[PDB]
UniProtKB/Swiss-Prot annotation, chains A, B:
Quaternary structure and partners: Monomer; homodimer when crystallized in the presence of crRNA. Varying the crRNA sequence varies degree of oligomerization and structure.
Name the record gives this protein: Putative CRISPR-associated endoribonuclease-like protein Cas6nc
Functional description taken from the UniProt entry: CRISPR (clustered regularly interspaced short palindromic repeat), is an adaptive immune system that provides protection against mobile genetic elements (viruses, transposable elements and conjugative plasmids). CRISPR clusters contain sequences complementary to antecedent mobile elements and target invading nucleic acids. CRISPR clusters are transcribed and processed into CRISPR RNA (crRNA), also called psiRNA (prokaryotic silencing) in this organism (Potential).
Family the UniProt entry places it in: Belongs to the CRISPR-associated protein Cas6/Cse3/CasE family.
RNA sequence: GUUACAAUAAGA
RNA sequence: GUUACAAUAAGA
């Protein structure tokens, strides 16, 4: 499966990355791809998770709780993934043509794009999250129905996630997977709250072990696990 | 200040360290230090935190969620600290004369005890928790009286932590500290729940910046921050 | 693709 | 004693 690393260069001195970029990055890419491949842009913007992208990785940093993350590195990377290398292809082009990113007060400049080597999977895999995994349910709170976010320690999590993947899979892949059974067991777990647009989404940054269906595993690896993947959630990476 | 690194060598075939070890380490040090020096043993047993020790540190490890932390290193390490170099000196002796330590299933053997080079503090410090930091208030749950454990997001957190350090300080240093003010801002934060004996204590694993009274700063640095430090809570290390 | 493995979570 | 910096936390 195709996965790319986009290097970004912070423009000014003492650059500071704001804590919640998910919507900015996503909408920015959408706009850029839409200029070239409007037809693919429509896939990016789909809820079904045609792709993922990670957090913006800052290899060396300090924290300014009121401002954001201090970038002490010369550059930052952003990993993007998809089962469809036509989506990858189109993103590389769009970005490189118009390599100007504005996140809050910090402007970046796209440096090298490159396709990344990606490891084969096994019967069981140990994944670490590259961007928070999101699994949502509906709950009556007051009157109006609203979105309740789940974490692995919640009872309905595994069952909800299972259905989200099967569902998502058949939607983007075109068919339902033959083996639909799988489990995950959490190893290192943390909660995070992200403001995307005018909303709030809460998710898990975790290291977990996946077992079971070998096609859903490929699917999650390539397209991210959980919901809102296209918004920058759900990307994992293989460790041992 | 005086800070030691006690090394532990796992005896069992496949070494699983249980997730909740405080009480067992506490109560076992408490004895080995009693048999040798009953008098110092009572400073340890005091609620006021005449000392701290850290999580048992395992460099190479992996998680069995129903079991514990699988130990993949040759040795693990405990870090004990105190403003009183007599206490530390006593623990090192007491532990050397009775090197056996049992935790859950695992039996350890005390290896080399050694001193740790400890940097001087500044006007401002960035500390990391070697032990989670515990700050409690009391609350009524129905007609029953309950411990309620606090984290920095709680309005009452800063307030009760000041009072707890000021109280601890005087009850051990012997006098009230001159400068009684400090602030703590959180950089990296994760919550943890430990079972110590019959009861559950929740606390904070975190990196934070300490601004304030220098004598309080050095007191927490030596004797731990927050409460219950005698049980292996609140130990910090200085970073950059 | 080292921010690449500390779970559990208000308990009597 | 590098498990050594991702805060914030149920909203309209």
């Amino acid at each position: 499966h195709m996965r790319i690393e986009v290097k970004l260069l912070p423009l000014k001195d003492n650059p500071i990355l704001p804590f919640n970029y998910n919507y900015e990055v996503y909408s920015q890419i959408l706009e850029k791809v839409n200029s070239i491949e409007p037809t693919i842009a429509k896939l990016l913007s789909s809820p079904h998770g045609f792709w993922t992208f990670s957090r913006i990785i800052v290899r060396k940093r300090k924290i300014l709780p009121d401002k954001g993350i201090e970038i002490l590195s010369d550059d930052v990377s952003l990993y993007i993934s998809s089962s469809n290398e036509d989506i990858i292809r189109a993103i590389a082009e769009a970005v490189e043509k118009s390599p100007e990113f504005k996140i809050g007060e910090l402007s970046f400049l796209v440096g090298d794009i490159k396709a990344i080597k990606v490891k084969e999977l096994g019967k069981e895999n140990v994944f670490s999250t590259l961007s928070p995994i999101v699994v949502r349910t509906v709950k009556f709170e007051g009157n109006k129905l609203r979105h309740w976010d789940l974490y692995p320690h919640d009872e309905l999590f595994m069952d909800r996630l299972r259905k989200v993947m099967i569902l998502r899979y058949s939607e983007v892949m075109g068919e339902t997977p033959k083996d639909r059974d799988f489990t995950i067991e959490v190893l290192k777990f943390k909660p995070t709250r992200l403001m995307v647009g005018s909303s709030y989404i809460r998710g898990s940054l975790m290291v977990f072990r996946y077992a079971g269906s070998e096609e859903i595993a490929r699917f999650g690896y390539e397209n991210g696990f959980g919901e809102k993947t296209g918004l920058g959630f759900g990307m994992v990476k293989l460790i041992e």
